[PDB]
Design a protein around this ligand. Structure first.
Ligand SMILES: N#Cc1cnn2c(Nc3ccc4c(c3)CC(=O)N4)cc(Cl)nc12
Ligand SMILES: N#Cc1cnn2c(Nc3ccc4c(c3)CC(=O)N4)cc(Cl)nc12
Ligand SMILES: [Cl-]
Ligand SMILES: [Cl-]
Lengths: 123, 4, 123, 4
């Protein structure tokens, strides 16, 4: 018999992104080649099958630094990290291959789906 | 607010 | 020029609630009289003006235990904590006064609004 | 997916 506030989940996500921008309560640095990205482990796990696996691991759960595969593109990661915190995906002709490869590695199925559909439309 |  | 995934914010919140149920990465215990509630500081801040103030404080940000005012009802807190993590509010005739008082203390304006409207309709 |  609950009532539901339609905008609540979006409002929560907006405030999680504000915390990220102010570097408040971030508990991990994701290293992608020469670049570093601070984030909240809980948000990373909630968005990515890869981070969900990493941070449920009894040893990796306590790491303050995670290094991604050297083939991962920092811009592609940046675009996906922004997506995690906003629901908005900056998908462009110039970045789609990198975004799709990063989403496959991060196990972000909905992003992979759409990248596949956008690529199929251009061929 | 809505009835979900 | 971003695209947006409509269900993303709800999917994130669902996974944050799963983390809470499994007690994964919870970093605070909220004590309400004889009861204890484990939660994620980032979610509490994102939902409540009171927790936002508490956890941005340079000393309180590092506390693992927060004790609420003894006038706060544990059931009212439980209902609001469930709301934070699900967007669903279990508002009943038997709990509305406690929920509204707790929402005022926690500074959860949208919950206060609706409690006020439901009370006005019954008088 | 939508155009926001
Ligand atoms: N507890 C918990 C919890 C925290 N996070 N999380 C999940 N995170 C996840 C796992 C796989 C995938 C995605 C997110 C997006 C995607 O495409 N795949 C799943 C579950 Cl079943 N549970 C949890
Ligand atoms: N950074 C950050 C950040 C984390 N959380 N958070 C806010 N949390 C909040 C503050 C006040 C109120 C509510 C939520 C619900 C309500 O009724 N009042 C606000 C801002 Cl402006 N910023 C942040
Ligand atoms: Cl996804
Ligand atoms: Cl609220």
């Amino acid at each position: 018999s609950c009532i539901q506030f339609t905008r609540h989940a979006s409002d929560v996500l907006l405030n999680l992104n504000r915390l990220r921008s102010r570097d408040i309560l971030t508990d991990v640095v994701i290293v992608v080649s020469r670049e570093q990205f601070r984030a909240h482990k809980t948000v990373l796990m909630a968005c990515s099958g890869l981070f969900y696996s990493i941070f449920t691991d009894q040893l990796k759960c306590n790491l303050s630094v995670i290094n991604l595969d050297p083939e991962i593109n920092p811009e592609g990661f940046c675009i996906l990290l922004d997506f995690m915190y906003t629901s908005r995906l900056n998908l462009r002709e110039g970045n789609i291959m990198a975004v799709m490869a990063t989403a496959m590695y991060l196990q972000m199925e909905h992003v992979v789906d759409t990248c596949r559909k956008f690529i199929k439309a251009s061929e | 607010w809505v009835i979900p």
